[PDB]
Write a protein that binds this DNA or RNA. Structure first.
Lengths: 313, 21, 291
DNA sequence: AAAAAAA
DNA sequence: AAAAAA
């Protein structure tokens, strides 16, 4: 019915949050995923201290975290998430010990522990994807003070190192910058800043985002883009009968990833750093694939965040 | 506020949406 | 009556892959060449360990590779290649011992050992040529993650160090960059990203690419250029009656407001003609013309 | 828009 | 084409 990843995430969130975990609210799913990501990265109080090569100023914080009491049952998480009495057992049983590595577990040969580590990795990936989607969603109506120029905006979203390790191709930030600057191996993955990520309520169900889905404008935009993307992407949405709140998806952008506009010099020709520039920018178009067929829509020339702000005024 | 428009889906980046012209 | 260069490759492919080796498929030939190259570079499981100056992680990787079980007969390599029972004998008798240098082979004077080393080197060259052609073919529709600017694109294809050591004039990548960023001399070879490599199905039989031979658009484009080359090169191909994804070569480029008016020289059946450039890379043109 | 590595 | 040879 469901792949291993989504089944693992559903089991984990159910075990940790009882009946309080709503399966149809994006905010609740994002909060649950954030808490689970903290639990599986040993970022909660009372978990192992990260000291392997930590600096003394970091060992101070790690020792403070270890000494601090672990979360108690019934604690309020986010807005409408409540920890069950059996969350400690789940944390002790389903979270690999700090520093666990797949090679060591495989050398052990225990099938149960191998499966546990596989579930841990899949859960980390799912939680990081939900985190990236929520970062886009927040950026749709809340500018990041850090992003002031195009160079800053190039490395969105600014998520932690664990996020980058889980999903290097979707997570930007300091570690994506470091990977790009440093040596690039065969495993190097570039930051796909506008990759399509289904809403959390769709991601945990396994339903791929497609034409016809009954989604809100903000969540669709968070799926296909983020705040500083061009406003023309709003053409991928259409309000339903009677307006209300939830509309429908009429199309999806093309070239969401893998856009290169280089032309190397060859056979006596001259190199081109950008085919597009080689010149009004506002005349550019995006190929939106609809059910009927692909249509080229003229760019708005304005940010998605500012379009949403203007339409909400 | 910020008036940037990052390059995406084949579109070119804009350093300022107002200055465009 | 093929050259020894191609005869060695054909014999090795036969011995190692039985009847599963189809000589009319570019993908199958590329898979076979990759397997033979990793066999002759001591990169398969169960082969000697590259532990002359390996670092801790590299030492561990090489020791694990040696300890791991070697490939066995019937193994599936790619999509349509199956190893035969004779592949162990071929690896034992034709692949030189790890670290073997031609100096010592010549000093010994054994004619058979000299012939084996020469065949090994020729096979490495052929395999690397096929690897470069397949890299071009892949890049025609999917660009390497390392290629973001022209400086990065200047070093395509990004192949391994052994590949560069075998074909310095065709292979790019990290070792080509290092050679450029170091000393230069007579032995130094310049990377030619658009050197004409015939398709493997033609290369292994010695058939030189020429006007009028049936090919596919991607085949010709990979043979004479790669993805980020200008799209005007697509004019070197013309579809046949009904197309069917198979056409014919009509020309071969030479030298293997005004910026977009630059022209390339195409040698046609009549004579050299000047064709105006398109301005878009072959990758972008193929993406836009796919539908 | 699979899996194996892994401040 | 022969030689060299992270």
């Amino acid at each position: 019915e469901l792949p291993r990843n989504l089944e693992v995430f559903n089991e984990a969130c159910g075990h940790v949050f009882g009946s309080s975990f709503n399966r149809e609210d994006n905010s609740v799913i994002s909060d649950a995923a954030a808490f689970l990501f903290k639990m599986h990265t040993h970022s909660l109080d009372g978990q192992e201290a990260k000291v392997l090569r930590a600096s003394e100023k970091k060992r101070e914080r790690e020792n403070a975290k270890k000494s601090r009491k672990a979360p108690e049952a019934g604690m309020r998480v986010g807005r409408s998430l409540i920890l069950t009495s059996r969350w400690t057992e789940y944390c002790a049983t389903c979270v690999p010990a700090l520093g666990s590595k797949m090679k060591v577990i495989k050398a052990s040969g225990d099938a149960a522990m191998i499966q546990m580590m596989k579930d841990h990795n899949s859960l980390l990936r799912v939680c990081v994807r939900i985190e990236v989607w929520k970062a886009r969603y927040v950026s749709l109506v809340a500018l990041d003070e850090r992003i002031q120029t195009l160079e800053d905006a190039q490395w969105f979203p600014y998520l932690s190192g664990d996020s980058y390790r889980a999903c290097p191709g979707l997570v930007g930030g300091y570690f994506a910058k470091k990977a790009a600057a440093g040596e690039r191996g065969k495993n190097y993955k570039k930051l796909n800043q506008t990759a399509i990520i289904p809403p959390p309520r769709f991601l945990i169900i396994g339903h791929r985002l497609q034409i016809g889905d009954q989604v809100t404008l903000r969540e669709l935009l968070a799926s296909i883009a983020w705040g500083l993307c061009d406003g023309v992407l709003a053409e991928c949405w259409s309000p339903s009968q009677g307006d209300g709140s939830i509309g429908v998806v009429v199309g999806l952008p093309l070239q969401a990833t893998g856009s290169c506009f280089l032309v190397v010099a060859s056979h006596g020709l001259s190199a081109i750093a950008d085919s597009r520039i080689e010149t009004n920018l506002l005349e550019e178009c995006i190929a939106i694939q609809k059910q009927d067929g692909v249509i080229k829509c003229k760019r708005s020339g304005k940010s998605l965040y500012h379009c949403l702000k203007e339409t909400a005024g | 506020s910020c008036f940037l428009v990052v390059a995406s889906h084949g579109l070119s980046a804009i350093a300022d949406s107002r200055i465009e012209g």
